[PDB]
Symmetry: C2
Subunit: 375 residues, 2 copies
């Protein structure tokens, strides 16, 4: 709801202020194409990795506080918002251009047959999407590369939740192999020690301790991971000795997840800023190239002189516009592309378009970050 | 007290039954010398490794339930039993032949000046000895190799206790370097998470979790370590939310330490058994060598034939005495030593002496293990 206003504000600011400066200097043919409305309406995703019978399917029902189609308390499920409670098989989901699952077609039927999108109107899903994963075992035989599909979600997911069972902590080689496939994205990982009320207090310490022991043994990062310890479902507690703990841990978890759409808003706001800066540089470059072109003859001779002297051009522009060499595009990649452009057809500099962007960066953004601040 | 009877029983059984079979065939000149009474009166030792201000000195006062000389709540201290409360500086301790600290002389004054033996009549010390260690810091500058002296205690100690502070868990590089020096003896290690009542329940989980995380990150062993979580001193509890836990953990700790003298008794009982078996083999070998020697001439010629055919002798004896080739001494090491012996001066086989040992192994040991069983 509130972050749908943020989404609208970003799209608006981009189309009114940034996009015209990209189109004026063919930004989209050099670097990246125009941003579609899909680039803005992204809800942060969560990947649930956990062995069989850990409680992932219940964990989802616990957050949503509601059932979802084809939940059945094994395959991949993408739980997302939807006007009506419905289910979409994977073979059809990977064709939907309004879904991030279009690239998943590379794994094929053996995977698609074990892939589904369950939709339902639920508050949680208005803000984020949950991707359940098949329960890892503790033999093997899947007609798709299970460790590569897991890897693929991890790179496009905002949060990864390793799920472990305090009643039966049995980290398997397959699970460990999956965790080693998530490395390089440890900041996305959190852990959940479920069914904590099933064991007595001493046993919880042995299990929880043996968990961290073997995790750090695997991830080999000085940055210890966060483990939310509790019993995550609607049922009563068995071993109430740590009731207060399990409740604070659940609140710490709800706060983590509830922050994801906010963190995403900022990430998008920063990406829009960086894009708007790159567009400025691109406009200053093309403009200078146009400025120097002769009024009539020696056009192809001047074009090649500019391309060869492009490194000097960069420094020329950095100084007379106080801009960083960091948001400049790579020198050689430009030169390779500037070969294919009639320099004389470029547009002279349009101060009207740059002012529109600089007025966005100085004034218009301070308010959005204020709209994000009001959680 | 009770394990002083075990000590006496072992010494008695060795002197009455084993030692005469070793002396009859010069066992002590080939393999290992006669066992002194010191070889039996060993009390298991404990090495306390822990950073500064963790509470080691209090931890010791907690177990003993009593002060000890020069405790001062930094240097090595060997807390051991003693008729009277006294203190012995290190420069004099390393000269005492009735102390295992005679080899420590290799590190010298810079270490000896930071080494002491505090004695006192205390029940705990009748059974075991505690070796406090200087508090590791969290700079460096000691005039002795701190990581080599620690290593030296670890190899002769029965139990190593890593001590950590839940109020300020700051594993330092020096401490980690020490823990890496204990590897290869992980079975001796236990951990103690002290001051657990100082933090709230959630913070305990973060600290305890971060501990195991970085420990397994260091020791790299699939065998997770045991961490006794509590507040180990006579004072009341601050955060009573986990009173029951901290009490069971302390009892689990007292049971671990209280078992050490029993485990040692068994280790000695097994070592005596293995020695008595090796003595038998040695007696059968020397006897056979004597048996084959000619009654008069060709003595040096026969001696060399036997030594060369000694591998065949081993198999000859293994079969006609149903004994394992495992407790046989190395073939070549014997041959190198059998050069220096007038074979004709050996003694013929003495069935009287072997029966004395076999009667010890069949009958006399079943009772000692019963004396150990009665904890
Ligand atoms: N918080 C909990 N405490 C104890 N048992 C639970 C809890 N949550 C789920 N379970 C049990 O664990 C089983 C596994 O549930 P499910 O989530 O379907 O498996 P998976 O997590 O592998 O999808 C269920 O039968 C349920 O009864
Ligand atoms: N169980 C405990 N809980 C809280 N504080 C403690 C506990 N035991 C000791 N302390 C405090 O920690 C400090 C360090 O004590 P000491 O054992 O002398 O240091 P070290 O362990 O480095 O020898 C002491 O001043 C004491 O007040
Ligand atoms: Mg599931
Ligand atoms: Mg101390």
């Amino acid at each position: 709801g509130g972050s749908q206003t943020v989404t609208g504000g970003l799209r608006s600011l981009y189309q009114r202020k940034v996009l015209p400066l990209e189109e004026a200097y063919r930004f989209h043919e050099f670097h990246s194409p125009a941003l579609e409305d899909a680039d803005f309406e992204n809800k942060p995703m969560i990947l649930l990795v956990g062995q069989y019978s850990t409680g992932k399917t219940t964990f989802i029902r616990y957050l949503l506080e509601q059932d979802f189609p084809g939940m059945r308390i094994d395959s991949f499920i993408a739980v997302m918002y939807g006007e009506t409670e419905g289910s979409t098989p994977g073979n059809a989901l990977v064709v939907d251009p309004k879904k991030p699952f279009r690239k998943l077609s590379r794994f094929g039927n053996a995977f698609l047959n074990r892939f589904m999108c369950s939709q339902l109107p639920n508050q949680v899903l208005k803000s984020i999407s949950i991707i359940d994963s098949p329960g890892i075992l503790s033999r093997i035989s899947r007609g798709y590369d299970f460790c590569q599909v897991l890897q693929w979600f991890a790179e496009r997911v905002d949060r990864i939740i390793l799920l472990f069972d305090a009643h039966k902590l049995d980290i398997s080689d397959e699970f460990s192999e999956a965790i080693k496939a998530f490395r390089g994205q440890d900041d996305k990982i959190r852990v959940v020690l479920n069914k904590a009320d099933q064991v007595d207090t001493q046993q919880l310490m042995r299990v929880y301790g043996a968990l961290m022991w073997s995790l750090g043994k695997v991830i080999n990062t000085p940055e210890v991971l966060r483990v939310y310890i509790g019993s995550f479902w609607a049922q009563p507690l068995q071993n109430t000795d740590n009731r207060r703990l399990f409740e604070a841990e659940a609140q710490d978890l709800f706060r983590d997840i509830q922050s994801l759409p906010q963190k995403a808003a900022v990430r998008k706001l920063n990406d829009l800023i960086k894009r708007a800066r790159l567009a400025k540089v691109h406009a200053y470059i093309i403009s200078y190239l146009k400025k120097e072109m002769p009024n009539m003859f020696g056009k192809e001779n001047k074009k090649r002189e500019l391309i060869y002297r492009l490194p000097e051009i960069y420094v020329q522009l950095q100084r007379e516009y106080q801009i960083s060499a960091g948001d400049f595009p790579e020198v050689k990649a430009m030169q390779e592309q500037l070969e294919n452009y009639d320099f004389t057809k470029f547009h002279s500099l349009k101060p009207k378009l740059i002012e529109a962007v600089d007025n966005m960066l100085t004034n218009k953004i301070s308010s959005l970050m204020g709209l994000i601040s009001q959680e």
